[PDB]
Amino acid sequence: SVDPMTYEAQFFGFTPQTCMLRIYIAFQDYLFEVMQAVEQVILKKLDGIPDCDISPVQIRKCTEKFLCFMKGHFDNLFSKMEQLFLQLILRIPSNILLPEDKCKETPYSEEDFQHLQKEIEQLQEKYKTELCTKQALLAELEEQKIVQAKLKQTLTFFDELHNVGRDHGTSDFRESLVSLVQNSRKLQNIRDNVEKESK
Amino acid sequence: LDHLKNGYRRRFC
Amino acid sequence: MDSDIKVLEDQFDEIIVDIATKRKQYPRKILECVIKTIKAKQEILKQYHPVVHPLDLKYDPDPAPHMENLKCRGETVAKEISEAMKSLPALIEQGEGFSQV
Amino acid sequence: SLEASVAEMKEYITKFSLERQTWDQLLLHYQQEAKEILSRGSTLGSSQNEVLNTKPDYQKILQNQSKVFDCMELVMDELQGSVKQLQAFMDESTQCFQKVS
Amino acid sequence: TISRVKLLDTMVDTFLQKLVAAGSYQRFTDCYKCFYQLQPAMTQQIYDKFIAQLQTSIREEISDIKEEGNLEAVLNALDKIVEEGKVRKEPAWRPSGIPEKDLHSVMAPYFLQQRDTLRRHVQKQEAENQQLADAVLAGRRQVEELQLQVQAQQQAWQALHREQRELVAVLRE
To answer: Which of A100, A148, A168, A197 to mutate to test the interface with C (most CBs of C within 10 A)?
Structure first.
């Protein structure tokens, strides 16, 4: 029991039961209206009696009788008609989903949702590290240019040294040394022969 | 005359 | 009951239509807000793109004031051992010229 | 049973009360969140961490150059000594070989 | 379908048929016998006026509440929503009473597009970092091979020492 019809509201915006109450009090008021009409119409025609008179207090409770009958049948029939109203009108079939909340048709679970939030934060952090390591790599390469050019400078100095050796006659020192020790050895030998034939 | 039923509870058995 | 049930059912109807109004039109306003806040967050994220850490430092160059000085002494020793290699075998010829008579 | 029905209704009133309260709280939450994030803007385990952690010392490299040149300098000192030791011998050799008269 | 409006006019019509079934004029007179013995033409005339003004007053009432909040239009819109919604037949989602859950379901798509946008930004910067680091490794192998050539020619000039030592050995008595 006690159906609040929460989903039947939000669409209509009034709830069906309250609406049926308004309709009830209106219908009842109209029934009592036409009964008041017939009583005050028979009473004025009732003044057109000569010879004899018939009391109005009797006709009042006469109307009260017909009206109690009318409230029995009226009330019952309005209950049945009102339950038909709540069944086939003023009801979301429970099969139907409102266009207001279509995104809830495939609901995103609490766990998928929290998972996706954590993923979002952790991807913000991941972006934040990737950018500064971009800057770290780029900075290391710009720094690396300098040592590359300095080593090219020392290599330039060695090539310039072999150039300054090439000019002035001795491009390869090692060869010069091995020939100069060779002919130094010969000169030593022949020098000893000349000093030992010198006396 | 009134004396009409007032109420008609909306959501009850 | 009676009048009490009418007051209670009245406030109950009010809370039903109220919570239904919330259920309907609140997710749209909240959605508007969170769309603003998400655009704002992803916008302030890109403002961090200039991280710019300097790094750098270096041992700098100690250039070539003396580099040309040792290359110049290299010219000196180069020419010296060249002319020595040219003048020594002549002394070998003077050497074996005296080895017979 | 009127008692059971009015009971369920008097529980629903409080349930929907708590839900309305939660809706208002939540909505104003996202509201002031958007307000503060929109008013806030005005006023290292990354990919390839090995590449970042593998960083050879370049300063020590430039230092090693500065001492390489020193080694080279004493190399040419030893050379420039050996040359003198040689043509000293050449001079005494040519002198004693002209002493043959 | 009956467009929900012919259903309500139909059921209130049934309601009047059932009410007019009661007070079947016989029920009106047999309690109203006093005054019914006099002018049974007036009794039936006033009964007819009663039944007519009752049913037309009540029909004018429901037709008045059809124009109250465009109830014809909103019940017709509900007819449309019922027609388009048919083919599902399973119980649709209803507000479970937990604002956090329903708010999760509605806020989900924008957080998904947020996730995918940030993730493709991260993808871009990650690829550019792969290229940049590849260049960095290239540069460090270049400095490595450079220092290798430097020390190579360095030892090339250090090799003269042996030749000088054999010179001094030859030149020693």
So the answer is: A168
Torsion of CA E32, E33, E38, E41, to 10 degrees: 60
CB B12 within 8 A of CB A17: no
Are C43 and C65 members of one domain? no
CB E106 within 8 A of CB A101: yes
Whole-number Cα distances in Å, A186 to A130, C83, E146: 72, 18, 42
SS (H, E, C) A78-115: HHHHHHHHHHHCCCCCCCCCCHHHCHHHCCCCHHHHHH
Q: Are D80 and C73 in contact (CB under 8 A)?
A: yes
Task: Give the Cα separation of A7 and A13 in Å (integer).
Answer: 10
Query: Which residues in chain C are closer than 8 Å to A15, comparing Cβ atoms?
Result: 13, 16-17, 20
For chain E, strand residue ranges (E) read none
Per the structure, how many domains does chain C have? 2
| Cβ burial D62-89 (10 Å sphere, 16+ → b, else e) | beebeeebeebeebbeebeebbeebbeb
Distances in Å between the alpha carbon of C60 and those of A198, D65, E100, E140, E149?
Answer: 64, 12, 62, 19, 21
Instruction: Report the number of distinct structural domains present in chain E.
Output: 1
C21 and C67 inside one domain: no
Give yes or no: residues C51 and C3 share one domain: yes
Distance from CA of D12 to the nearest CA of B (A): 12
Residue A132 structure tokens: 């500064």
How many C-beta atoms lie closer than 10 Å to residue E23's C-beta? 21
- What resolution in angstrom units was achieved for this structure? 3.2
Query: E31, A66 in Cβ contact below 8 A?
Result: yes
- Report the amino acid identity of residue A9: A
CB-based contact, B5 to chain C, within 8 Å = no
Q: Which of C37, C56, C75 is the last residue of a domain?
A: C56
CA dihedral E57, E61, E64, E70 (to 10 degrees): -150
In a domain, E102, yes or no: no
Whether E18 is in a domain gets the answer yes
Residue D86 CA to residue D94 CA, distance in Å, equals 12
- Interrupted after residues, chain D (C–N over 2.5 Å): 43
Instruction: Give the single-character DSSP code of E39.
Output: -
Technique of determination: X-ray
* Residue C9: domain span: 1-56
For E49, the domain range is: 5-85
Is C51 in the same domain as C66?
Answer: no
Q: In the structure encoding, which two tokens stand for residue E124, read together?
A: 């871009």
Whether A127 sits inside 8 A of E118 (CB atoms) is yes
Same domain, C47 and C72: no
E58 and A27 in contact (C-beta within 8 Å)?
yes
